[PDB]
């Protein structure tokens, strides 16, 4: 029965119940249903008008908190002598909820999510005075042509949604829409992306938002700067389906749900909850 | 009253006399794809009796040292009967499932089965960064044994696995769990040979224990597809 | 007492569940202490490459 629930439910008073046939404490877990034993039906209650709002447990309010999804300190200098592995004043980033575990465990509570990403790009700068650098954050789709240089002609943004912003400005906030080809983001994808057997397991590219190619629009300055670009994603307009067990073991990788666990309890493989002495030993005991 | 249950699908039928109930998963009964949700434009073949019936999988020996068993759907059924031939000949499928897991023992045995149907069970390998390959996931009709079912082989918790559609086979109380699964995918239809929506998971939370003569107690699984559609006809692949 | 016959196992089991009721309520949202992150996860540098 679907009903609008704004506050937690009231408790009716109850009296002495001595009745054959009606055993409300006795329930069947084997049916899979959670026990419907009301607190009135189990113990003797008073009338309580419960005014506690349930609004902070809304899945919209649960997940619409702008959490960190990307962070790169990258050097901002002459890159004529640097190696061809570091960021030559730009970084591509396939937009990925899996990189940071606080938002990842929250989004992996559910199986399917339908949200709009409210990407806030916080750029901060340190010296190896601070410059007022202008940054471009060109939104490239999944697999499309990502730039090769800082001053390459992919940054002209004929159709890719670039956002130009400065360090001295407030952080650039754009709204990435619901960009899955399916009706929800498959947070877990039990299956393979490709038709051949070489495809990566669990990684649905429909779950992938796209690339976030971020460069610094200014040319290279005679001193080098370490520019750290933090990206904050706020899921919004959130519809969520099929909740899951929250992940207890520590994450190993962003590409999959591999597990190793801690060496000892808590959150270990053989023992998730921290150990105690016996089953009849109370750890936090009020001894006076 | 709810202990007896006959499930008539197609030419198949299953009675059970110690049943708990049957779990219509997330309060949702399977149906065909409606026109407002439909995507593939061609007329889907709906055989309605050649596939909508109980395909009984191979039984697995419920023992003392057993960790668990898992069957990924429809990967368990992509080579069985007319569901398998419709899978191999079509690009798309949309089918709910009616899993009926059979496991009985005497009134002297003890044990508990977490018969839980996990949607989108992205497994994880243990103590490595390499993703599980094709052979580690797509076991087929045989199914797979859990390696660490206490964490459900994906770092999550078995303790919270009752958030999924589940029933219990407590050998004290009942001997058959029945979970009626709808179409659980973000897409309306999907390619069956490279994706599995539901994963039936069967876990020994309480192991098989008795003091009598140790008869073989197996766990038989009878998965019936429900409300099958199939679009995109072509040659078979297998 | 737990009283079993000679053919049942003498050491029976109890599975303990907990849910909450309709009275239940939560507020003052915080980040979970159940998960941590000491370093970057594996292949997280490969999401930038």
């Amino acid at each position: 029965i679907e009903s609008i629930i704004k506050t937690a439910t009231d408790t009716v008073k109850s009296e002495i119940n001595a009745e054959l046939g009606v055993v409300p404490s006795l329930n069947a877990v084997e049916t899979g249903a959670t026990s419907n034993t009301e607190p009135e039906e189990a113990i003797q209650t008073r009338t309580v008008i419960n005014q506690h709002g349930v609004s902070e447990t809304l899945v919209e309010n649960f997940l619409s908190r702008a959490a960190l999804v990307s962070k790169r300190s990258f050097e901002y200098k002459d890159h004529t002598s640097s190696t061809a592995r570091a960021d030559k004043n730009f970084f591509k980033w396939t937009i990925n909820t899996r990189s940071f575990v606080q938002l990842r465990r929250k989004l992996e509570l559910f199986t399917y999510l339908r949200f709009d990403a409210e990407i806030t790009i916080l750029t901060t700068v340190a010296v190896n005075g601070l410059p007022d650098l202008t940054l471009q954050a060109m939104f490239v789709p999944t697999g499309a042509l990502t730039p090769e240089k800082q001053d390459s002609f992919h940054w002209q943004s004929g159709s890719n949604a670039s956002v130009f912003f400065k360090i001295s400005d407030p952080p650039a906030r754009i709204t990435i829409p619901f960009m899955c080809i399916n009706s929800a983001y498959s947070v877990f994808y039990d299956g393979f992306a490709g038709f051949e057997k070489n495809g990566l397991y669990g990684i649905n590219p429909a779950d992938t938002i796209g690339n976030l190619c971020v460069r610094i629009v200014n040319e290279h300055q005679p001193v080098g700067f370490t520019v750290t670009v933090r990206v904050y994603m706020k899921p919004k307009h959130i519809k969520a389906w099929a909740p899951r067990p929250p992940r207890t073991l520590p994450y190993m990788s962003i590409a999959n749900a591999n597990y190793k666990g801690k060496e000892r309890a808590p959150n270990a493989l053989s023992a998730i909850i921290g150990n105690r002495d016996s089953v009849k030993t109370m750890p936090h005991n009020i001894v006076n | 009253s709810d202990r007896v249950l006959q499930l008539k699908l197609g030419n198949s039928a299953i009675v059970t006399q110690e049943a708990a109930n049957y779990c219509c998963a997330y309060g949702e009964w399977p149906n065909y794809l409606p026109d407002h949700e439909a995507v593939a434009i061609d007329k889907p073949t709906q055989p309605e009796t050649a596939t909508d019936r109980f395909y009984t999988l191979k039984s697995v020996k419920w023992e003392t040292g057993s960790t668990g068993w898992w069957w990924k759907l429809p990967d368990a059924l992509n080579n069985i009967g007319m569901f398998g031939q419709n899978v191999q000949h079509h690009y798309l499928y949309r089918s709910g499932f009616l899993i009926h897991v059979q496991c009985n023992a005497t009134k002297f045995h003890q044990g508990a089965l977490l018969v839980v149907a996990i949607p989108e069970h992205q497994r994880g390998a243990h103590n490595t960064n390499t993703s599980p390959g094709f052979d580690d996931i797509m076991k087929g009709e045989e199914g797979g044994t859990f390696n660490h079912p206490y964490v459900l082989d994906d770092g999550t918790s078995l303790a919270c696995a009752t958030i999924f559609p589940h029933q219990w086979i407590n050998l004290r109380t009942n001997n058959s769990a029945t979970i009626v699964l709808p179409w659980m995918n973000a897409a309306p239809m999907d390619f069956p040979l490279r994706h599995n929506q539901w994963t039936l998971a069967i876990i020994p939370v309480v192991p098989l224990g008795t003091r009598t003569t140790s008869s073989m107690v197996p766990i038989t699984v009878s998965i019936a597809p429900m409300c099958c559609e199939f679009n995109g006809l072509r040659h078979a692949i297998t | 007492n737990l009283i079993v016959p000679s053919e049942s196992s003498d050491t029976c089991s109890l599975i303990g569940f907990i849910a909450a009721k309709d009275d239940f309520s939560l507020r003052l949202m915080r980040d979970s202490p159940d998960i941590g992150q000491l370093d970057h996860l594996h292949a997280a540098e490969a999401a930038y490459q």
């Binding site: 029965i1 679907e2 009903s3 609008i4 629930i5 704004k6 049916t31 899979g32 249903a33 959670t34 419907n36 349930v54 609004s55 809304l58 919209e60 309010n61 619409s64 709009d116 709204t175 829409p177 619901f178 706020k234 919004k236 307009h237 959130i238 | 109930n21 049957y22 779990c23 219509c24 998963a25 997330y26 309060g27 949702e28 958030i163 559609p165 009626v180 | 849910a19 309709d22």
Partner: peptide, 30 residues
């Protein structure tokens, strides 16, 4: 609340959907 954009996804978060149905989880049986 404000939403001076031309796209309905660009609005603020819809923190008003108080409709809940726990009986598809706590009582998923038929």
């Amino acid at each position: 609340q404000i939403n001076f954009y031309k796209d309905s996804y660009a609005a603020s978060a819809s923190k008003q959907d108080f409709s809940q149905d726990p009986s598809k989880f706590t009582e998923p049986v038929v």
